[PDB]
Amino acid sequence: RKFFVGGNWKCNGTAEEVKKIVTTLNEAEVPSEDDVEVVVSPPFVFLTLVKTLLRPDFSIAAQNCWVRKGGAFTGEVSAEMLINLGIPWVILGHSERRQLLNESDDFVGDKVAYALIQGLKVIACVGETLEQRESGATMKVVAAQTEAIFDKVWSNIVLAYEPVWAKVATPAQAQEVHSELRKWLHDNVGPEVAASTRIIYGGSVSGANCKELATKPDVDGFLVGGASLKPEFIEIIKSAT
Amino acid sequence: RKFFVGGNWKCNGTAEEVKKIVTTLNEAEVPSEDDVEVVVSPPFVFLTLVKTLLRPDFSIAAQNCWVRKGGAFTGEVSAEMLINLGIPWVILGHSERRQLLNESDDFVGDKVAYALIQGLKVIACVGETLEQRESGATMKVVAAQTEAIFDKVSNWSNIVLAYEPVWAIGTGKVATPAQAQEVHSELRKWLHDNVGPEVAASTRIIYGGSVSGANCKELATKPDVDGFLVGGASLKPEFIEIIKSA
Numbered sequence: 281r282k283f284f285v286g287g288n289w290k291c292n293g294t295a296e297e298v299k300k301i302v303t304t305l306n307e308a309e310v311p312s313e314d315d316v317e318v319v320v321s322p323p324f325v326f327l328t329l330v331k332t333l334l335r336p337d338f339s340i341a342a343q344n345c346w347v348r349k350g351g352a353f354t355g356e357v358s359a360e361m362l363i364n365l366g367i368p369w370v371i372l373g374h375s376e377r378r379q380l381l382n383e384s385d386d387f388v389g390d391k392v393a394y395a396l397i398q399g400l401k402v403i404a405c406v407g408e409t410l411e412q413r414e415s416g417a418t419m420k421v422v423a424a425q426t427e428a429i430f431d432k433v434w435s436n437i438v439l440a441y442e443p444v445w446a447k448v449a450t451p452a453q454a455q456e457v458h459s460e461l462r463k464w465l466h467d468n469v470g471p472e473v474a475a476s477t478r479i480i481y482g483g484s485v486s487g488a489n490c491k492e493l494a495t496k497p498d499v500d501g502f503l504v505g506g507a508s509l510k511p512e513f514i515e516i517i518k519s520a521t
Numbered sequence: 522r523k524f525f526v527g528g529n530w531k532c533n534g535t536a537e538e539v540k541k542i543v544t545t546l547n548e549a550e551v552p553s554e555d556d557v558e559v560v561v562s563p564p565f566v567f568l569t570l571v572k573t574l575l576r577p578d579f580s581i582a583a584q585n586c587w588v589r590k591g592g593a594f595t596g597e598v599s600a601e602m603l604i605n606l607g608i609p610w611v612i613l614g615h616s617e618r619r620q621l622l623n624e625s626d627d628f629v630g631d632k633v634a635y636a637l638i639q640g641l642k643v644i645a646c647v648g649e650t651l652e653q654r655e656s657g658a659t660m661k662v663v664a665a666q667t668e669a670i671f672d673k674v675s676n677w678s679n680i681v682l683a684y685e686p687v688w689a690i691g692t693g694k695v696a697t698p699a700q701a702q703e704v705h706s707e708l709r710k711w712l713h714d715n716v717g718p719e720v721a722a723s724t725r726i727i728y729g730g731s732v733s734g735a736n737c738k739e740l741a742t743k744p745d746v747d748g749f750l751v752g753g754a755s756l757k758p759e760f761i762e763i764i765k766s767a
């Protein structure tokens with residue numbers, strides 16, 4: 281499995297700040313496209329700006345898209361719009377959309393299937409809350425979330441586990457969930473999907489905590505949050521080696 | 522009250538189609554900025570393209586923004602982000618978001634309040650469902666949606682209210698001039714009696730929902746109809762004829 285590092289800018293950025301991030305990414309030296317796959321994800325309104333300024337060996341993701349074809353959906357952005365604009369990736373089911381915008385398991389599932397059929401590659405996010413983990417329902421929740429995406433879809437998916445519950449989150453806890461998610465793919469979709477699908481870790485990843493996580497056998501990379509806005513995003517990319 | 526024509530492109534557009542729409546608008550002969558205030562609303566991903574291409578005497582609106590300041594809200598676009606990109610307007614509370622994305626009356630009001638304090642001008646959408654009209658509930662519903670917006674701010678100068686009955690959205694069924702005039706005048710009375718006479722006198726109330734070049738002239742003649750919010754026709758040359766109903 282090729283190491284995968286995605287940077288989720290979330291709802292952040294001005295034109296000025298975007299320019300400095302992109303110039304910093306453009307001047308960094310990282311492993312080759314055969315050793316790490318790098319995706320950066322700006323807000324909708326900056327996607328074309330980053331696309332025309334960023335080095336082409338990094339790819340761009342949108343942070344969301346609509347559940348079906350375009351039309352009378354004020355405020356929404358369709359997969360075909362992103363494809364028309366040369367954006368190859370999309371993040372779907374991020375915990376903040378599941379929690380704050382009330383995206384259901386099946387809604388996310390329908391979104392993933394529709395982006396995939398149109399030709400987007402998808403970082404599909406799953407993750408359990410603090411209360412869900414305290415109750416012992418980590419795997420049941422994460423399995424139900426992944427199942428809703430599988431019920432509807434495999435080559436062009438990266439799975440991202442978000443420890444929404446985190447609190448200290450250990451590499452061993454990451455490996456437990458990643459290995460349990462891969463076994464779920466093995467048992468429900470097929471061993472080839474399990475062996476080939478990248479499962480990346482999305483828990484407060486920083487230059488300072490990434491190395492021990494990246495050595496875990498079933499962690500295939502990272503979905504980076506706040507550090508994706510910072511120069512240390514480059515150190516996280518270099519943990520691929 | 523200056524006549525006001527907004528065009529909502531919804532979830533529509535390609536780079537080629539957007540350039541063609543803007544070129545059609547750039548070549549149009551329409552009344553002056555003293556006679557009519559024109560706003561066009563592309564999807565997020567085209568906002569900066571349209572800002573560069575569009576004749577500067579028309580203005581641009583986003584189709585939504587987040588309810589508060591930015592941060593950890595994946596997928597959302599903040600009001601300050603729009604101000605940073607030079608986008609002066611936003612459409613908020615569109616029926617497609619109230620219904621399909623479950624934006625509550627107070628959620629829309631909180632979004633309006635935040636967009637206003639960050640400097641945006643707001644087209645705030647209200648309107649009753651088919652069942653609500655058929656039960657005789659129209660102005661109770663519209664007044665309640667309006668109250669939930671207006672009771673969240675202390676300055677209402679940059680609000681344009683768009684009345685779009687849900688049963689007129691996409692259906693080919695437009696309100697009659699009499700039906701629109703009834704809602705717009707009764708709504709303006711509500712502002713007069715619950716907010717203030719000056720706000721009632723100055724707040725543009727525009728009609729949306731199946732507006733066309735063929736029906737816009739008679740609607741525009743009604744005294745409390747201050748303009749239009751235009752859906753599918755905003756993608757067409759027909760949008761120019763609606764602007765000209767000013």
Ligand SMILES: [Cl-]
Nearest residue numbers: 654657658659
């Ligand atoms: Cl009625």
Ligand SMILES: [Cl-]
Nearest residue numbers: 690691731752
């Ligand atoms: Cl319509």
Ligand SMILES: [Cl-]
Nearest residue numbers: 529750751752
């Ligand atoms: Cl509309």
